[PDB]
Amino acid sequence: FPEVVELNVGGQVYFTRHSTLISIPHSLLWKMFSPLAKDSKGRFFIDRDGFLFRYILDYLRDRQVVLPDHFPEKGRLKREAEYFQLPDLVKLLTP
């Protein structure tokens, strides 16, 4: 795996460091990028909502997440956290 990974999430492209992807062991992204579907341009493909991945990705990097005011999609973000298997992130999203 390269040092900076080019991902395609539901058509949303993200560049990120490999260290961020494997930050939480036994998580979905850890299982994927620890020693895969690719698109036409060769980018590794994640079949999930591209917009919500920003905040999933921010948690892996900083182990915390600041949402905007009146964030209309917390329920959706929590669902994504479940898919990527991030128990603590689901916990933070528990009201």
Author numbering: 23 to 57, 65 to 124
What is written in the article reporting this PDB entry?
In contrast with the previous work, the expected closed pentameric structure is observed only in KCTD17, whereas the variant C-shaped pentamer, found in one crystal form of KCTD1, is also observed here in KCTD16. The angles between monomers in their assemblies vary from 90° for Kv4.3 to ∼65° for KCTD16, giving rise to observed oligomerization geometries that range from compact to splayed. Evolutionarily distant from these family members are KCTD16 and KCTD1, which belong to closely related clades F and A, respectively. Neither protein binds to Cul3 and both have now been observed to form unusual C-shaped pentamers by X-ray crystallography. We show here that this geometry is also maintained for the KCTD16 BTB in solution. Modest deviations at high q for KCTD16 may be attributed to flexibility and solvation effects not accounted for in the calculated scattering. Binding was observed for each of the BTB domains with the exception of KCTD16, which showed no evidence of Cul3 interaction. In contrast, KCTD16 again demonstrated no interaction with Cul3.
